[PDB]
Design a protein around this ligand. Structure first.
Ligand code: NAP
Ligand code: EPR
Length: 275
């Protein structure tokens, strides 16, 4: 079953595995050809306990949110934690509020639980963007705000310009990609009450031979796959949650079992040393 962790300093616990939705209903453009299959996969994921759903206005050109919108109707809205994101072309005040409105129309819901700046746009003042996001919070359209792909220095800047708390920073983090460690970002999050949300937590399964030999030994000792070990490694870290993409039932099932793996201190030190 699903491991839960506190989001930021909110007093609220969320599933420590999110459901990644990139690819569902298309990538950069809408793909309508598998809509029924995709809605059924989303429903199955949610029923298995994947109630934290990660999406974005860019995903499937808006169509990913539309498919999520159909799938969530089989459940109680308040039981779900839905994350969306505004694309860097839309970070000026009027464009952001329009993006938010359109995201809510596609999801067919009255609010998102978490709304993220998807990527920074250096041309648009952060204070403007964050003030627009606070308008959404004040109106009840957003519960919490956060950011994505912000290094430590830009997260610090956002925190200083934001009326609302920044509850998370969603960045790439996995057994080979250690930019958040080298940047001091993970330490900063852990010391300042910010959740680090690791996307591409399996590195899209593209790993080196050296990494693979270490993971194989640990996996064997736990009767697990190398990917379950990669997830357990992230989830062992304070303030870290992960968003795998699992477009099939086998991977949904496997990744959920990873939340039960208890890595030893020496296993953690060996894994830490692979980057
Ligand atoms: N904020 C951002 O800029 C940003 C950027 C990238 C991604 N994201 C979010 O993070 C999610 C994850 O990103 P990602 O797709 O790059 O990362 P990922 O989870 O590291 O890689 C996904 C790949 O791993 C496979 N997989 C999943 N579980 C597996 C298992 N147990 N065994 C073997 N293979 C497995 C999937 O295959 P199947 O699908 O066939 O199971 C898929 O090909 C995205 O959907 C998105 O929601 C956010
Ligand atoms: C190909 C790499 C991309 S582009 C794109 S949008 N996403 C999802 C995201 O950034 O949230 C990818 O994972």
């Amino acid at each position: 079953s699903m491991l839960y962790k506190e989001l930021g300093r909110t007093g609220e616990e969320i599933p420590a595995l999110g459901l990644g939705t990139w690819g569902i209903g298309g990538f950069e453009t809408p793909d309508y050809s598998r809509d029924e299959e995709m809605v059924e996969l989303l429903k199955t994921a949610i029923k298995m306990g994947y109630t934290h759903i990660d999406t974005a206005e860019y995903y499937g050109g808006g169509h990913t949110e539309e498919l999520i919108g159909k799938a969530i109707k089989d459940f109680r809205r308040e039981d779900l934690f839905i994350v969306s994101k505004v694309w860097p072309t839309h970070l000026r005040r009027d464009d952001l509020l329009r993006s938010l409105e359109n995201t809510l129309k596609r999801l067919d819901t009255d609010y998102v639980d978490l709304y993220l700046i998807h990527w920074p746009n250096p041309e648009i003042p952060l204070e403007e963007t964050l003030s627009a996001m606070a308008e959404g919070v004040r109106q009840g359209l957003i519960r919490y705000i956060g950011v994505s792909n912000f290094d430590r220095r830009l997260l610090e800047e956002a925190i200083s310009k934001s009326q609302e708390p920044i509850v998370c920073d969603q960045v790439k983090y996995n057994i080979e990609d250690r930019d958040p460690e080298r940047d001091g970002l993970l330490e900063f999050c852990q010391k300042n009450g910010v959740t680090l949300v690791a996307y591409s937590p399996l590195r899209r399964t593209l790993l080196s031979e050296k990494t693979k030999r270490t993971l194989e030994e640990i996996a064997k000792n736990h009767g697990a796959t190398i990917y379950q070990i990669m997830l357990a490694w992230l989830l062992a870290k304070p303030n870290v949650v992960a968003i795998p993409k699992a477009g099939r039932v086998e991977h949904l099932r496997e990744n959920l079992k990873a939340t039960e793996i208890k890595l030893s201190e020496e296993e953690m030190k060996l894994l830490d040393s692979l980057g």
